[PDB]
């Protein structure tokens, strides 16, 4: 039951996305993004246990998906650089996010649930 | 100035469909659908001029959009044969409409515009 | 699990559509849709049981979202009546098919992931 | 206009208005510094952002101001903004055009891009 979660959908061959990078970052006092996680796509397109519950505090988030890279192997030229979602976490309290993205190769879409533990 | 309106969009390579075609069908009172207009996408994306907005009369209406012939001529397996948008019409006085499509040979995105 | 699942989220509240009910049709040889299988989704928006391999067969099917309905509840007057998918179905050997679907009053956008199992 | 952008709101099924959007450039120094900004007009589009000339090859950030267009009309939004990065001009002169579907806890971006 981790806090964050990420998805990545391939919406080309209609599967989950395999090898993509995804990095998390937290909003400073200077308004600097400093690193928070990282981790790799798995072949379920699924990231679980990025940042512990006691971890995630009150601010500023940014989840990068690195798309171009996932295209340029599998042999297609992608478009986007990469996706960001940037959202304020826990403003009211504690809860849990998922972050879902379906990925093409010229475009993206996103989506967030916020659910109360 | 037409009452209803529909536009596809390719994701795969980032412009807009091409040789897609549409048919647009409305609701009897037999609860069947009989055709009420036909078209081709133009290399712009877009479908101009569907119905006029005195045949566009109140009821339930259905657009279609023919993916599957659009993906083979590419070259590529699509999993959709076809995407339907159904939308009741003219509910209360006439209205303008617009129906956007994101095609994806494994997905497709739909929204829809009302202004008076 | 199932050989088609359904999963339905909702854009406005952050949360996964509840109380939607699902109509799956099949298409016959007179080119005329037939009851198939019906439900109603969870209040984590997904279907499960909907269909078995055994049944589930080569072929063109139709599921259907009932959309109106859930906006209802909610006050919120809804541009579509229902949203459809259809595809053609088992073509090479059983397989594993997922549509999901994200709702807004105005919009709506659906996906498809195709899996060998 | 070699860069538009285009936001819709799926709850209202209308344009997007009164949206502040920013553009941003990286720098030899990997820094953004703003390069254009704007607002949503009546139809939720933007024209002249930039020209011919001054668009140049690089790393190009998007923003568009979500979170205060949503606190406007009584609704807490998820999203503070929306951001998308592109490389443009890589293989030369083409039309970029970023198309935004905003919802309280979505959006869903799309790009076209031609060769003139």
Avoid: Q
């Amino acid at each position: 039951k981790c806090p964050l979660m990420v998805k990545v959908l391939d919406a080309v061959r209609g599967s989950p996305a395999i090898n993509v990078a995804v990095h998390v970052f937290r909003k400073a006092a200077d308004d600097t993004w400093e690193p928070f996680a990282s981790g790799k796509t798995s072949e379920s397109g699924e990231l679980h246990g990025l940042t512990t519950e006691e971890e995630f505090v009150e601010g500023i988030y940014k989840v990068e998906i690195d798309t171009k890279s996932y295209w340029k192997a599998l042999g297609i030229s992608p478009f986007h650089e990469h996706a960001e979602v940037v959202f304020t976490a826990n403003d009211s309290g504690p809860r849990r996010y998922t972050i879902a993205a379906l990925l093409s190769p010229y475009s993206y879409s996103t989506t967030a649930v916020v659910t109360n533990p």
